[PDB]
Write a protein that binds this ligand. Sequence first.
Ligand code: HEC
Ligand code: HEM
Ligand code: HEM
Lengths: 21, 64, 76, 109, 236, 17, 373
Amino acid sequence: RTSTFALTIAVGALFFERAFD
Amino acid sequence: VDPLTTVREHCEQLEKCVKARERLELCDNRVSSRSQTEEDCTEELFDFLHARDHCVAHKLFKNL
Amino acid sequence: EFGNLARIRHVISYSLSPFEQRAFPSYFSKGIPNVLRRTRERILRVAPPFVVVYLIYTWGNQEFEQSKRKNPAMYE
Amino acid sequence: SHTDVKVPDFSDYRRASEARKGFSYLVTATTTVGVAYAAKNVVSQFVSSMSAGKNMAFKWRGKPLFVRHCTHLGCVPIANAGDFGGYYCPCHGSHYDASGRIRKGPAPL
Amino acid sequence: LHPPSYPWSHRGLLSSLDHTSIRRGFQVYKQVCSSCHSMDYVAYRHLVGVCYTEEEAKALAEEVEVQDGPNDDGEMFMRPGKLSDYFPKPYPNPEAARAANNGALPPDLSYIVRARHGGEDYVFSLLTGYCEPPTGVSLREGLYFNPYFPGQAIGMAPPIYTEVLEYDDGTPATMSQVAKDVATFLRWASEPEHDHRKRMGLKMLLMMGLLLPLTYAMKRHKWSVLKSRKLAYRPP
Amino acid sequence: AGMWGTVGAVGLVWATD
Amino acid sequence: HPLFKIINHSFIDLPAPSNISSWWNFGSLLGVCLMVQIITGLFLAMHYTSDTMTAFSSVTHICRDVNYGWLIRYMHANGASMFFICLFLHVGRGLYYGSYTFMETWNIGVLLLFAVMATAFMGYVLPWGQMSFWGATVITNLLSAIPYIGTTLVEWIWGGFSVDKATLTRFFAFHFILPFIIAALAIVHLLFLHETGSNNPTGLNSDADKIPFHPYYTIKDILGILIMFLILMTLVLFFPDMLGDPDNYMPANPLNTPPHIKPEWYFLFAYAILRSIPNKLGGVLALILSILILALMPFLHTSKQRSLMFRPITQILYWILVANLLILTWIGGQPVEHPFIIIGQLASISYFSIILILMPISGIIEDKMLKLY
Ligand code: HEC
Ligand code: HEM
Ligand code: HEM
């Protein structure tokens, strides 16, 4: 789903930040 | 004992530095060879210097 | 704007769906051979000037070097 | 004519359906995630740059250190003035007692 | 003369400064170089590093009383310093330095390495390259022959000798060890962020290695459509 | 659109931290 | 919607040629860079003062203390370098593919270059180092060359007998405005171009094959932005001083000067040209012409083909022009002594003779070979 696509992506960027940081 | 001195000495021992030194020695001898001349040797001095110095860095920092 | 651009006639233009065509056609495998072809075709006209340049730079450096180089004999 | 020419073979480009789509989306998702990751980092540090019966004061720590024997809008209360023998802030009329407690006016604390 | 190459450890692409040495080079500056040079832009707070944490810096911060504090009129030197205290200066006025430096100027060394072409090397070379003046050498005032020095008349007095000082760590204080160590510190101060940055650069390389093929794959998705388009001319 | 509000909120928390 | 119509008209439904190569990315990169230079310049301006008293210091503070200052400052400097790299490749694309026949776009263009050059001197002089000081005096004195009103003009700009605080503070504003200025001039650029549309590497009328811009040349510009950011961050985070001159970290010695003084690389050749002409005035003029010769370029096109894709002799002359432009960039660096000087003199003679004489004659010969002339 497009909306969920963005949603999971936002969350993905969310956690990735911490992990990458 | 400064490893710098030792390494410098060692590098000089390197045949390359030995030959570079040969040049310098011949050239510094040349400095005293003539008076009215302008055989400063700074050029040859620098020549040997850099050559030897390369060798030095090539094997000084590790001792450092 | 699109429409009213050119009087192009009888030019059928078939196409394939993005998700239907292989996602990433090999570039190194297929494209670069042609790229090599492409580059080799022009390089034969591109590097020649630079070929000349490098030479100039090299000669100049050493030349200037010798220029600075002083002769013991000079003023000896 | 209408039927003389059949669609040319695109198999050369053709890939072997929703799975394919999902993978492609997955790619976009990851990339968006990457963009976002950088965003939090860049924006945060980006913003981070802008980041760093008598009274007497010695401007300790860059602020008036009242020592004696405005909660409202931050002016200097004037010592030895007011209706509560402590302080008064000429800005909006807050009267502080000697204890520095706001007794009258609009000063909150 | 073109200073040759040198294998500085911190200079490693993803590697960083060796604070131990940095520390040692800060000692070298404090005991030798500070008499004519001062890390003005560097403060004890700036000095902080694995070499010297704020705590150690505090010791050094409290280790000085020079111009750290002013008096009733803020003249001369009147009080010791603390963490915020910036590095002490050997001279309260440029003239002072000039006076105590053959009339010449001992430059503060905060950004010295950055300033000098091939600084780290130059520094090392100058401090340890006086060499020998074969001929035509007339050093006028407090000068020291050094082919590495542009004029071979450095006037930067050679202040380092075998056991010039004593490293608290105990690492033999050979002229070179001393020179190399202080070099590290000087470099560290010139770019207090050298280590900080290289970590960013590593994260940047990892993120670009992740993101460039993925953005290339998107682009090649949306451009495949055209790159497969087959045109045919069918005049009636 | 409903989830967009939610999506933004999630990312917002992350970014704001 | 009257605001979204212009945005649609210039970025989404704009008919673009389908076959434009990566070069055509570069101008968009320039716009992104300008943005970067400007935004970086803002923070650089923040925590910064135009005072010789505190200009060099707060900047060192930026390099040392300002939160992420070292990052924003070196991003600003290497983004100016990236701006000039993208500018030179944009101008080279315009010269190679015959895009100068869009004459109004080219003139907004040639002017744009002069402006960007100035912003460089501006940004350059601003940190108040040894090199900035001695560089400013040098180019400001360039103006003194003017035959009659030169002295006055120089003194005006300096705002005094010699560059001093008076200059630093005013140069600060130009370097805060010229950026805004150039930005607008670029906007003019985009308008004068959409009236005609972009060119293609074949140089032919691409009206039969045009595609949208949103999904085809947007993701391409995004990829080019990502690659340019990769090169910019590997310039900032790994080799932050390979393009600058260490002299910068030397508070200006109002009294002393750098034994070796050189203008920055982007202009190195420009000055190389000056060094070549013996007469001071001649140098200044030639220097100007160096940039201006480009404006003069749309009147020198004598070929019946717009692009150089099908023109091999003029391709050879173009790459010889790029070659001696690189030679002039090298010479500027070299000091004044044999034989650097002669090369400089020839290289300048060859540069002006290739642009002025050799390319139209070659285009006439190429038209004769195709039985057109
Ligand atoms: C007791 C005196 C003294 C000590 C100790 C001293 N210097 Fe200097 N230094 C000077 C003087 C005097 C000058 C000015 C020379 C001039 O301006 O011509 C100078 C100038 C310099 C310069 C400027 C040369 C140039 O390239 O422009 C450097 C670099 C320098 N010193 C490095 C050092 C380093 C590195 C140390 C120790 C690790 C050191 N100095 C210790 C007296 C000293
Ligand atoms: C309006 C936007 C801009 C502002 C506010 C601005 C502001 C500044 C400031 C305050 C500095 C001094 C800090 C420093 O030393 O780096 C500076 C330096 C500089 N700026 Fe700008 N700038 C802007 C745009 C530009 C642009 C577009 C260019 C490119 C042409 C440019 C090129 C430079 C250069 C080369 C320096 C010298 C960097 C150095 O010290 O090595 N700036 N800018
Ligand atoms: C301030 C610096 C400049 C910026 C920001 C800039 C920006 C742009 C942009 C965004 C475009 C549209 C994209 C493109 O055509 O690829 C463009 C087109 C163009 N620019 Fe520039 N430009 C600048 C300077 C110049 C200069 C100095 C010249 C002349 C040498 C020039 C010549 C052109 C030409 C000929 C085109 C049309 C090329 C084509 O599409 O075929 N520009 N510019």
